Amino acid sequence: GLGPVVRCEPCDARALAQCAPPPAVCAELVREPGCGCCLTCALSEGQPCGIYTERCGSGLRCQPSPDEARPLQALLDGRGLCVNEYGPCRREMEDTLNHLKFLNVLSPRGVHIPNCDKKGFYKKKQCRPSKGRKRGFCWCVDKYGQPLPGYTTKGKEDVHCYSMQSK
Amino acid sequence: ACPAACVCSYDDDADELSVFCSSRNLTRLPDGVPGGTQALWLDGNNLSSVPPAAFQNLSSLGFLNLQGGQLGSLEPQALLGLENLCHLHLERNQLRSLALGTFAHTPALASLGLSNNRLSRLEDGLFEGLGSLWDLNLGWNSLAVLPDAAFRGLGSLRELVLAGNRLAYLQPALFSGLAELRELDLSRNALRAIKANVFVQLPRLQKLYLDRNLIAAVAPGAFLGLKALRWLDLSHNRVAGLLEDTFPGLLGLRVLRLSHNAIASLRPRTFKDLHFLEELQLGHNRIRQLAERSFEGLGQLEVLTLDHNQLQEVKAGAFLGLTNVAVMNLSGNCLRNLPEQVFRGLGKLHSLHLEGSCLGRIRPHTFTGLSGLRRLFLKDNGLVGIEEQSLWGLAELLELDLTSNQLTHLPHRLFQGLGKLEYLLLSRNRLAELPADALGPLQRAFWLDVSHNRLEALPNSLLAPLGRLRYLSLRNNSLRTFTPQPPGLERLWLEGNPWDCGCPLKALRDFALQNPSAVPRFVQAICEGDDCQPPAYTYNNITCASPPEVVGLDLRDLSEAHFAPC
Amino acid sequence: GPETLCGAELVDALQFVCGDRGFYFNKPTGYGSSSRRAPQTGIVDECCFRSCDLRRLEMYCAPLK
Numbered sequence: 137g138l139g140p141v142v143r144c145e146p147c148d149a150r151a152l153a154q155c156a157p158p159p160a161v162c163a164e165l166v167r168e169p170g171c172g173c174c175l176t177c178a179l180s181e182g183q184p185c186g187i188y189t190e191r192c193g194s195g196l197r198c199q200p201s202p203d204e205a206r207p208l209q210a211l212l213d214g215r216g217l218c219v220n221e222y223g224p225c226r227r228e229m230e231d232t233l234n235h236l237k238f239l240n241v242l243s244p245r246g247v248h249i250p251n252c253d254k255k256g257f258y259k260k261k262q263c264r265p266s267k268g269r270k271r272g273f274c275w276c277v278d279k280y281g282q283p284l285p286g287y288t289t290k291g292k293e294d295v296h297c298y299s300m301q302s303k
Numbered sequence: 304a305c306p307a308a309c310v311c312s313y314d315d316d317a318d319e320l321s322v323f324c325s326s327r328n329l330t331r332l333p334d335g336v337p338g339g340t341q342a343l344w345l346d347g348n349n350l351s352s353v354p355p356a357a358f359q360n361l362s363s364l365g366f367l368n369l370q371g372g373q374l375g376s377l378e379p380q381a382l383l384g385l386e387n388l389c390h391l392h393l394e395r396n397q398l399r400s401l402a403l404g405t406f407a408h409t410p411a412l413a414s415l416g417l418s419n420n421r422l423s424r425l426e427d428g429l430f431e432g433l434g435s436l437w438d439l440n441l442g443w444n445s446l447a448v449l450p451d452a453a454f455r456g457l458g459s460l461r462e463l464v465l466a467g468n469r470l471a472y473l474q475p476a477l478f479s480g481l482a483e484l485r486e487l488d489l490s491r492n493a494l495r496a497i498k499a500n501v502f503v504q505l506p507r508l509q510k511l512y513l514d515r516n517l518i519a520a521v522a523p524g525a526f527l528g529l530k531a532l533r534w535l536d537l538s539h540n541r542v543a544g545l546l547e548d549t550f551p552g553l554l555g556l557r558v559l560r561l562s563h564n565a566i567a568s569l570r571p572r573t574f575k576d577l578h579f580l581e582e583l584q585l586g587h588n589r590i591r592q593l594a595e596r597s598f599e600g601l602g603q604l605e606v607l608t609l610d611h612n613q614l615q616e617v618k619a620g621a622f623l624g625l626t627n628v629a630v631m632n633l634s635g636n637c638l639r640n641l642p643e644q645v646f647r648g649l650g651k652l653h654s655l656h657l658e659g660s661c662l663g664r665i666r667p668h669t670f671t672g673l674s675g676l677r678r679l680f681l682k683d684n685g686l687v688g689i690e691e692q693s694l695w696g697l698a699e700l701l702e703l704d705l706t707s708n709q710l711t712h713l714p715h716r717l718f719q720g721l722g723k724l725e726y727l728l729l730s731r732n733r734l735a736e737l738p739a740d741a742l743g744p745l746q747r748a749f750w751l752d753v754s755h756n757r758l759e760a761l762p763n764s765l766l767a768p769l770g771r772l773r774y775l776s777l778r779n780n781s782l783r784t785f786t787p788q789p790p791g792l793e794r795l796w797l798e799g800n801p802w803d804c805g806c807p808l809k810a811l812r813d814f815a816l817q818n819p820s821a822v823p824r825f826v827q828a829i830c831e832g833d834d835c836q837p838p839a840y841t842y843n844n845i846t847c848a849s850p851p852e853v854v855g856l857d858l859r860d861l862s863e864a865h866f867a868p869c
Numbered sequence: 870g871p872e873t874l875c876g877a878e879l880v881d882a883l884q885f886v887c888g889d890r891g892f893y894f895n896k897p898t899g900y901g902s903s904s905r906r907a908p909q910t911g912i913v914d915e916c917c918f919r920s921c922d923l924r925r926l927e928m929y930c931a932p933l934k
């Protein structure tokens with residue numbers, strides 16, 4: 137009745153080795169958001185904030201616009217301000233999270249829940265958990281959950297699942 | 304007034320005094336602790352058997368987390384004084400036994416956990432005076448037999464877990480007086496031969512798991528009173544035969560699973576009164592042939608998946624009552640001499656796999672009634688020829704797949720109806736030359752793929768009526784010259800052919816120099832981070848061979864002045 | 870009317886809000902009196918099929934030591 141707990145992985149010199157570490161010159165060097173250990177310089181008061189940008193300066197808070205009627209999307213696309221009858225998918229989500237309840241501790245890169253809308257059908261496109269300023273792999277699917285061919289032009293871990301174009 | 308050894312928290316929204324004595328090396332309990340506590344954490348320490356007088360003077364509680372540790376004994380009167388307790392956790396200690404009376408001082412309990420302990424031989428009447436319990440967890444222990452009336456007095460129970468144990472027998476009086484149970488779990492035990500009078504007085508059950516046991520018989524009459532029920536599971540077992548009166552009345556059922564069993568034939572009128580299923584699974588069984596009207600009454604299915612039986616022949620009229628069916632797997636069984644007109648009626652499908660079967664040929668009336676399809680697979684059968692009038696019926700279609708067969712030529716009136724294709728895959732065949740005009744009707748196509756064949760020339764008048772290409776592959780095909788007909792391309796693979804670096808091969812040089820991202824040099828293969836250490840690279844090098852003065856060299860870099868008599 | 874969020878964006882948002890504390894899938898039973906009685910299904914179902922916002926997300930973080 138309590139389940140496991142998820143917590144970020146303590147990083148070490150290995151992480152700093154893999155993570156290119158050249159902090160440019162500045163004031164108040166801080167850590168990047170989420171849970172990732174690569175030091176950068178902080179933002180001022182009044183510049184755009186988000187989930188994949190840097191974190192605001194000291195004694196500051198990142199809150200969305202005071203209207204917009206859509207907070208979470210507005211924060212996902214980086215538009216904050218630094219201011220002081222089952223279906224084909226429910227049947228999968230069910231026996232997915234019916235397995236993550238008999239274990240002790242785990243890591244946030246081991247959760248694999250799908251992405252499907254409010255009628256049980258897979259949505260358009262699927263992705264994987266990120267690690268702070270570094271997104272994950274993504275691909276395109278169809279209504280019942282079969283992958284489709286596609287390529288990329290900008291780089292890996294990037295795709296635009298359009299109506300049918302997978303550019 | 305905190306014992307100066309634990310993190311003392313304070314009021315947040317009520318008078319909680321959450322005391323955090325968790326991750327610290329402790330031996331037996333501290334003293335001088337607050338009296339008005341509302342939650343206490345003690346997990347992780349190295350305690351042992353508790354003293355009888357240990358938790359008095361704490362007439363307010365409701366949280367006694369005690370996981371981890373090295374506890375094994377609960378001496379009598381241990382829980383004396385706790386009248387307002389509401390949760391308890393003893394998960395991973397190494398307990399061994401519980402005497403009678405240990406729960407006489409604590410009514411109003413609402414959850415209990417004894418999961419990864421080491422204990423057997425429950426007594427007869429432990430959980431008495433517990434008319435308010437809601438959960439009970441006993442999985443992963445050494446239980447092997449239960450006396451009658453072991454669960455006596457548990458009126459308002461709603462969940463129950465018996466997994467990882469070693470039960471082998473179920474008498475007809477165990478689940479008696481449990482009129483509000485809601486979920487039962489009996490997986491990973493060693494049961495056999497479900498009897499005929501056990502599940503008769505649980506009129507509110509909703510889930511039932513019998514996953515991995517050794518079951519070889521199911522008496523006719525079981526599952527009789529279970530009106531409300533929505534999830535059966537009998538996957539990994541040894542069921543050897545279904546009778547006609549095995550599921551008589553389970554109206555509200557919605558998910559059956561019968562994979563990986565050893566069923567060897569179906570009967571005339573199984574599967575009736577199941578007007579509301581939406582998923583069946585008969586996986587790696589040994590079904591041999593389908594009689595007429597075997598699936599009858601399942602007028603609302605959605606998924607079938609008969610995917611690795613030894614199915615050798617199907618008679619006309621087998622799939623009869625399946626009206627609203629959308630997906631059928633069928634892929635893996637040797638269906639050699641299939642008859643014709645066998646798919647009639649199913650005009651609501653969307654995807655049909657047929658790979659892995661040993662088909663052989665395609666005759667004019669193989670796929671007839673499927674005027675609703677959208678995806679064909681037909682990958683690795685071994686066809687030697689497809690006839691001219693085979694695909695004149697599939698109006699909607701978005702993907703063909705003929706990857707590893709052995710065709711040698713295509714009739715010149717094959718794609719007459721398919722005016723909506725978007726993916727055409729024809730790899731690894733033995734084609735020798737593509738027809739002269741049989742590409743007109745395709746007007747919405749992109750992503751062509753003809754790699755690994757043995758083509759020999761591509762005329763200019765071949766790719767003109769295709770103004771939507773964005774991808775093209777020609778690896779390892781024995782060509783000599785080529786001029787880019789679609790101007791808005793975005794990919795080109797050209798490695799493996801014996802190019803002739805002369806005058807007519809210059810537009811390719813210009814297009815490759817001015818469009819370097821459409822014709823790359825190499826792209827880095829996929830990587831996931833842990834295996835990013837090695838940088839796997841797929842190549843795309845263009846070579847010169849027919850002229851010996853530029854032999855060996857690449858085309859992108861040769862001289863900048865060889866094209867001066869050109 | 871209400872918005873909805875499901876998939877891996879949910880996991881990223883949860884990582885962003887809580888931080889280096891952690892999170893559970895059910896409520897951390899703070900002074901359990903009716904937490905079990907009144908059944909809160911879970912964060913996944915509520916935010917994938919009914920409605921979702923920041924207060925509910927904050928309610929599920931682990932408590933600091």
Ligand SMILES: *[C@@H]1O[C@H](CO)[C@@H](O[C@@H]2O[C@H](CO)[C@@H](O[C@@H]3O[C@H](CO)[C@@H](O)[C@H](O)[C@@H]3O)[C@H](O)[C@H]2NC(C)=O)[C@H](O)[C@H]1NC(C)=O
Pocket residue numbers: 608610632634635656
């Ligand atoms: C229709 O049925 C076919 C039956 O073969 C399904 O294809 C199979 O899909 C499973 C997915 O678990 C493949 O298993 C995988 O095998 C590889 C090793 O080969 C292993 O590394 C993976 O962990 C996994 O076990 C299986 O190989 C594959 N069979 C074939 C054709 O190779 C197919 O998915 C079903 N399609 C549906 C349900 O729509």
Ligand SMILES: *[C@@H]1O[C@H](CO)[C@@H](O)[C@H](O)[C@H]1NC(C)=O
Pocket residue numbers: 326327328
């Ligand atoms: C508990 O003891 C171990 C070694 O016995 C020590 O490393 C650890 O620091 C101790 N815990 C604390 C909180 O000091």
Ligand SMILES: *[C@@H]1O[C@H](CO)[C@@H](O)[C@H](O)[C@H]1NC(C)=O
Pocket residue numbers: 356357358359360
């Ligand atoms: C509770 O109070 C009794 C009587 O005042 C006292 O002697 C004891 O130490 C306290 N705690 C325990 C261990 O019961």
Ligand SMILES: *[C@@H]1O[C@H](CO)[C@@H](O)[C@H](O)[C@H]1NC(C)=O
Pocket residue numbers: 755756779
């Ligand atoms: C090139 O095509 C031929 C024809 O089938 C094949 O035998 C050969 O293996 C292919 N090359 C490579 C590198 O696979």
Ligand SMILES: *[C@@H]1O[C@H](CO)[C@@H](O)[C@H](O)[C@H]1NC(C)=O
Pocket residue numbers: 824842843844
């Ligand atoms: C292809 O060219 C690259 C240079 O771009 C070279 O390093 C590689 O060895 C070449 N591979 C082949 C197939 O010769």
